[PDB]
Design a protein around this ligand. Structure first.
Ligand SMILES: COc1nc(Nc2cc(S(C)(=O)=O)ccc2N[C@@H](c2cccc3c2OC(F)(F)O3)c2ncccc2Cl)nc(N2CCNCC2)n1
Length: 312
């Protein structure tokens, strides 16, 4: 006893075992998948009997099976008509990321702010605003320092053309889940027929020796440093100090003051080599009044100070 959804692009079907997983709801996931594919393919919305998406019982195997059958037959008609890899829309991507999470993370957890279990609530929209603001290209290398189950990396890889996206996570439980998130994401993206950039989710300590040169060569760092201690903050600034001009750090708490004024007593501070701006979706956003910080490596701040001493 199972439910099957045929892929709109001819990939392997999505197979769900009945009784469906508890999770959000698995039956609603199947209905929303069908609706998303219908929104995506106008011939499919035409071929599909309208009534089948109004009249359903998620608690009935036969009712759920009939819904899947109607969709599957409509996909078959469309595949017969066509007989004779684009990036996902923002709406579809939100669905795909939630779907990937639901199929990957199965054990209870605590639902703290910006935690994997609440990604859909404020993270998804905020990461979407951030992507629109920093405008990465094929020359960029993106790294999430403390990537959790890899959700930010998956979103950014599905939305941008960076050369590569990396996620590094130290903790055992999220890094293990990231392995399933990776598989589930690649599988589901193929199922929908959607393109994503290259990415790697790995287990590791971003403060290790190996990671020193990796951070130095990164063009865009993403780091939720909100709850970081002074030691991790100090070590990170030491890593950032080796970054290239124009290198960027997107964070939840600033690494240098917004009003940093270089003088003779603060030449050791990271503020001497980076621009820092506070960004806010509120500056059409109706979500939480959130803020984030964009840091840009710029050693001309330090150069202009020495230049001004020699040229009064
Ligand atoms: C407010 O409570 C709070 N906030 C944060 N973090 C936080 C605070 C604020 S603010 C100043 O209060 O407005 C805004 C954004 C974030 N996090 C964002 C984020 C971080 C870095 C760059 C960003 C970004 O968003 C961005 F895309 F724009 O660029 C985030 N982190 C992780 C995954 C997805 C997302 Cl989207 N972390 C914690 N914790 C630490 C974790 N476990 C519980 C306590 N608790």
């Amino acid at each position: 006893l199972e439910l099957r959804l045929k892929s709109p692009v001819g990939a392997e079907p999505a197979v769900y075992p009945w009784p469906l997983p508890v999770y959000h709801d698995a039956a609603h996931e199947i209905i929303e998948t069908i609706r998303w594919v219908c929104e995506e393919i106008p011939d499919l919305k035409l071929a599909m009997e309208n009534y089948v998406l109004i009249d359903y019982d998620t608690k009935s195997f036969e009712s759920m099976q009939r819904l899947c059958d109607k969709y599957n037959r409509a996909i078959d008609s469309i595949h017969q008509l066509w007989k004779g890899n684009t990036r996902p829309s923002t709406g579809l991507l939100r669905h795909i990321l939630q779907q990937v999470y639901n199929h990957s993370v199965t054990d209870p957890n605590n639902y703290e702010p910006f935690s994997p279990e609440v990604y859909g609530e404020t993270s998804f929209d905020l990461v979407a605003q951030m992507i629109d603001e920093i405008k990465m290209t094929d020359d960029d290398l993106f790294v999430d320092l403390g990537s959790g189950v890899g959700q930010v990396v998956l979103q950014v890889a599905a939305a941008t053309n960076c050369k590569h996206h990396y996620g590094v996570e130290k903790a055992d439980i999220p890094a293990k889940y990231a392995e399933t998130m990776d598989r589930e994401f690649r599988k589901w993206m193929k199922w929908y027929g959607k393109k994503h950039a290259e990415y790697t989710l790995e287990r590791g300590d971003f403060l290790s020796e190996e990671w020193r040169e990796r951070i130095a060569n990164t063009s865009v760092i993403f780091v939720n440093n909100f709850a970081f201690g002074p030691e991790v903050d100090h070590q990170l600034k030491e890593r950032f100090a080796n970054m290239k001009e124009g290198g960027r750090i997107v964070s939840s708490k600033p690494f240098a003051p917004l009003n940093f004024r270089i003088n003779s007593r603060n030449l050791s501070d990271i503020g001497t080599i980076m621009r820092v701006v506070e960004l806010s979706p509120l500056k059409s956003w109706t979500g939480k009044p959130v803020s984030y910080y964009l840091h840009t490596i710029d050693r001309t701040i330090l150069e202009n100070y020495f230049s001004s001493l020699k040229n009064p």
